[PDB]
């Protein structure tokens, strides 16, 4: 089994990359694609609260992302791993670190301690970081100043997380055309998987 | 202003005591009594999720109690404290420490780290612990329920041993009129010294 997470800002080509990699991996592996809350009833109820939030306190929002994360992990991810599946997960702990910790200003270490409570040691086996520049990402989103700066800070946050901790992290150049980003991601995954 | 929390297992007469103490304190102080979620919409929605939980993972449950704690703190407690009020809160961080941390077995220090993210330094000024023996508590209320009850009491003892200065323990084995009186006097002594 393998728990593989995908990280990156918006405009990193993440949706295309996961879908195309899934289509190639299913030839050799029992693979699933997922994202939080991913159909888990409690997680879906949490998601409704977050999306209905009127200027929700950023720490309450972080705790709700973390509670949705745990429900998705325990009720969907772990049973799939037990079946021997390759789980392709769109966003996990690192999104809360980059978005809640860095971009929203809570503090990466405070958000880390919260999410370590949530995942209880279950870190991804492999994390694909779709490393897009802010300018390329901006163009992919189009195809506001506060939004542009928020997108910039998300990337700055990811840069901080990957520069500090790196072992499961595999950075893929997402400034390339998407066919190349798919090929580099697929090859990175196959290299990991074929080493058991 | 003062933020005073009330803690204890079931059977400690905690609800009755806080209600009576609050009714007496309103005569001399600008005071409110509340509990989580306490009407805050997001907290109420989180409460519904917890109550609807079918064998809910204990850490998800702890995170939801912590999210309800923050909403109630931010929208009710902090605005009242800024208005200079005495805030009486029935159950706070120590309830998550005793129940989720100790009794459910996640670990007090793990649950403390989670709750410190939720309260962001807003610990109670004073915590009233209604110290009921497991035997009196049992009587005031099967093997599993009695074992969980004893575990909560044991958890509260460990917490109070580690943070003696924040707690004031009231003998909850006495008749409730005495528990009310000792709790009231403990609070007044604290309020008249600040
Ligand atoms: C509004 C922010 C946005 C977003 C977009 C779509 C959904 C939606 O599902 O319709 C969404 O709701 C979610 C998603 C995941 C988990 C929950 Cl509980 C609610 C959402 O966050 C509220 N952004 C998009 C970029 C990534 C952001 N994000 C994601 C995760 C997983 C995290 O931990 N932190 C974070 O800020 C959310
Ligand atoms: C079933 C557990 C029970 C309890 C009783 C009544 C309510 C109810 O409101 O009807 C309740 O729901 C709540 C209460 C507070 C906050 C939320 Cl989000 C939900 C509840 O916990 C699910 N016990 C009773 C003993 C104390 C327990 N407790 C309380 C708090 C505040 C905590 O942090 N941890 C904990 O285990 C809950």
UniProtKB/Swiss-Prot annotation, chain A:
Coiled-coil annotated spans: none
Pfam families tied to this protein: Thymidylate_kin (PF02223)
Superkingdom in the source lineage: Bacteria
Catalytic activity: dTMP + ATP = dTDP + ADP
MF term (GO), any: dTMP kinase activity
Listed GO biological process terms: dTDP biosynthetic process; dTTP biosynthetic process; dUDP biosynthetic process
Residues engaged in binding ATP: 8-15
Family: Belongs to the thymidylate kinase family.
Entry protein name: Thymidylate kinase
Organism of provenance: Staphylococcus aureus (strain MRSA252)
């Amino acid at each position: 089994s393998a728990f593989i997470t995908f990280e990156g800002p918006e405009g990193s080509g993440k949706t295309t990359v996961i879908n195309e990699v899934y289509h190639r991996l299913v030839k050799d592996y029992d693979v699933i694609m997922t994202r939080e809350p991913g159909g888990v009833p409690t997680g879906e109820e949490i998601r409704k609260i977050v999306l209905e939030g009127n200027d929700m306190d950023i720490r309450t929002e972080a705790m709700l992302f973390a509670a949705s994360r745990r429900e998705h992990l325990v009720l969907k991810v772990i049973p799939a791993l037990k079946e021997g599946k390759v789980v392709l997960c769109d966003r996990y702990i690192d999104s809360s670190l980059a978005y809640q910790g860095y971009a929203r200003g809570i503090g990466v270490e405070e958000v880390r301690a919260l999410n370590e409570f949530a995942i209880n040691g279950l870190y991804p086996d492999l994390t694909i970081y779709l490393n897009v520049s802010a300018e390329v990402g901006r163009e992919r989103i189009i195809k506001d100043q506060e939004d542009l700066k928020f997108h910039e800070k998300v990337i700055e946050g990811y840069q901080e997380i990957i520069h500090n901790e790196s072992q499961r992290f595999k950075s893929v150049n997402a400034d390339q055309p998407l066919e190349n980003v798919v090929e580099d991601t697929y090859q990175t995954i196959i290299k990991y998987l074929e080493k058991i």
